[PDB]
């Protein structure tokens, strides 16, 4: 059964499932996550789609940073009350999330052997860097720096794993103007990490 | 009367004018050679075989001619207008089954203009600028930003647009732009007591009037030009 | 059976299987494609090898763009009469394409839920960007911008899926000269997409 | 059994397993390799961690290049006496290398059909390029050019496959100073190749 | 005595001073509005609902106010000090259950300074430099490197630091830096017989006294400024 | 006669000259210290243990000496010739089983030149250029492009090569290059009636005579230098 090798938000949820900005009173964006167990690694496939107007108005500025922060317990279940994503991940049922309980979700987690908590001599191994793109209204691709940070902090004793994705741009012009701004969509970003034992 | 080789293929006029945009993708339809046959239709001479005879700036193999339909397209070699503004293209239509003989036919000229995109960022032809400003001086056009843009002199891809980045918030100055010279004439609308021994240092940002092309947007990182004006 | 999880052109076909340039009277290049079903994603692995002289002479110019455009029907079978690649894809038999019919080829296709046809509000999600390289004769790597576009248009009612790969460079010198130009080979490019249901 | 689809050095070995620099009298760094059989491809996941002081002092210079060179015999077994990595690869046992013999290790190897030995007309297909990062002490990411070279040379008749990874930077400042230099760790690098038959 | 709407919410002072670093991440805690209620605790008027009334440079939506706690944070719009050095922020505390009426309350002003990071690489305001050097000339401060840095004039992110890249190994010259003008005053500590008709060409590297920010480190690729001095 | 410690290890000459290319990869074979033993072969004193005593520009740890064979290689620290043109290397051969005593031995000097690669793009030392051209003026060498290249003054990695990018298609001008000064002397081979009040604006591209190195090719994006000449 290959549907149990994926842990992911669904393809295009009907409502926003993530609250990036703290000023937002409710969920303001759709976070698309995918985690695929490829051998001893996890292939992670992430992007965001803006829903709220104040999230979509970020394309009118030239210095933007925002952050999806995800916390997971000892079984790998998402801590939605502390995470940006407010809907728990699940397995594959076609284009949608499955419904039941999670089996071996802990194996999807970043490995604490490779990515330890609170080790100053080994902090450099917690970092992943990359680039995604924002297509403008005139089909201009603007590069976006992505910093993925694995197992950085535990907010409480419940948190056992941590994934912090940070998108940012520092551009010479705003990618859009106030009239032409429609929706902040980032091109997908694929990174890898060594996964925890099942 | 048969469909013998008895005439030359017929054009509609000797001069065809097409036009294509700079940096267009491959297989972009530039134009069409609208020809016709004076013989009977559905015949061998009606099967017109167009043929590009000559490019005058022949070195880049830019255009492609669909020999069956006469549609002229762009190729994988990308057009750059700032090295070749326009192209001239001698083509001929040929009757028969594609036999190549030295028999004369009717051949036409094609003029293809290349339409400019704003693919060049304006740069300043001057580096240090400084002016002397006194009191009861107003509407004073003392200094002018030299700029240089390569995009088709006279067009809106070439006309400089200026904004203040820092230094002028009180409203001391204001930029007009000269189009015959592409010049950032910056003015003086608020007077300074010259005796104050003050500074009015500022820095500007240079860009074209039209928005940049999608190839060079996201690559445009303007560094503010630091004009220091002493009063 | 892990040979049915790959849909791909073969490794080094004996003759050219793709016609990139429209001026070419026959196939002018070898297109190497690989599609691997990794969970709910497809890992796609593409490059080109020049065969014809007029395709290989592109390395003597500093502004190049070319495009492999692929159309697929409702079952995921390639429409060779409309696509750049003129040989249908097949499964794995060692280093070669298999011979029989395709099983669950539709699952290799980009998902119309994630990548819809003709939706102006969601067009930005159809775009993938990246970089490959061209090694010169003096072992200089020239960067090549790649734009992958998923489910953009249907030429007819037969087309149900669409993958447009576009390579381009805009360099300050020609990577080769007329004597030193041997063969246009691009470094491989790996991208991901959310796949259609099987 | 999905543990046999990975060939890899272990996660954080207790001692250094690789000798990058020739001036080193013993192993001076930990090389982390991972090879995952994804369909007809291998996903390769590599980075280095500095152990010795003379390997870690490279961060105090602005022009660095170093090379992990790996040679494999006809069965895919690593030739440790010729390779930079002095410990043979093995399968997955949790976060550690397994112990027994290798099964179908030859399938993890780069394909000699796609990547042939000593063909001048097809040398350009042996090249992979990419970028990893070095996080500085002030959390500055410095880009590192990576050149992966597949099946370039055989030192003897025993060598049947070859993977040369070369990291280098040419920066405008040294990433560290002599006091602030702690450990040279590169961000992980993922590349793909067409794999040999099993 | 009930917890009626009988007063205005109480501030500790009319002027609050906070401070935040340039290019800070989102949800960075800038400051806190320490207010109090003169009424009974655990009451409706004790539930203070803070509210940002006005930014004076209102156009970028930079700050966020936690209306329950009064903690002021940064947002996803990243701060750039070199366009706005500081911010002024009129806020008001409101009692009740969040009812919005035109009843006056006590409202305070907030001043937020933006702390500068070294996010700008210094560039030279002069391009060609050349001096004449004679014999029995020593401790001679003949030429000065113009530089320009945008990072908060007077700070160590703005003060130029100079090193020789090539040309001066004998120890002919030595750079001092003027701070009132940000000037690379390069000296002459080893004499040259001017009759020798020699050359002392060299090239320098310009950088700030403080280390560059982590955003622009790894993007700093200095090109050596080629100062040619003829003796 | 035994193989006692009775002599000093024998060199072939006191001065060894090697040579290595700039930006060479690690473990690139620079040279070899060809020494010999005056004692019996296959002996302890025959086991020569070479040892690098001193680098004179000792700060970068560039070279490695195989103490068994005497082969000198490059290390992971990459050579840059434009900071250190050559190196001097005092080494000594030692007999015995690697015992380190203060007993004198025969020690030699090694001179290693670094061979230059074209790793620097030439840049113009002048920014604005303009000349006055009259009629019956031909073969006129009125203006000269200042350039600056760092790659080993006198070499072909340093000699400027010029091409016209735009402006001169009629064949008005022609660039010669001065090698003693590295100067783009541009000429005048087609006369202009000065009374015409015309313009002959053009733009050139500067590059070295030799092709650029593979490190900086694909990073070379020339911006055309806009020389405006008024007639």
Author numbering:
A (entry chain C), C (entry chain B), D (entry chain A): 128 to 325
B (entry chain F), E (entry chain D), F (entry chain E): 100 to 330
Lines quoted from the article behind this entry:
In 2011, desmoglein-2 (DSG2), a component of desmosomes carrying four extracellular domains (EC1 to EC4) has been reported to be the main receptor of HAdV of serotype 3, 7, 11, and 14. In the present study, we investigate the binding mechanism of the ARD causing agent HAdV7 to the EC23 module of DSG2 using biochemical and biophysical methods.
This hypothesis was confirmed by the cryo-EM analysis in which two populations corresponding to HAd7K with two or three modules were found. HAd7K-(EC23)2 and HAd7K-(EC23)3 were solved to 3.5 and 3.1 Å resolution, respectively, which allowed the fitting and refinement of two atomic models using the existing X-ray structures of HAd7K and EC23. The two models are very similar with the exception of the extra EC23 module in the HAd7K-(EC23)3 complex. Furthermore, each EC domain (i.e., EC2 or EC3) interacts with one HAd7K monomer. R316 forms putative hydrogen bonds and a salt bridge with D265 while the other HAd7K residues defining the pocket are F269 and V300.
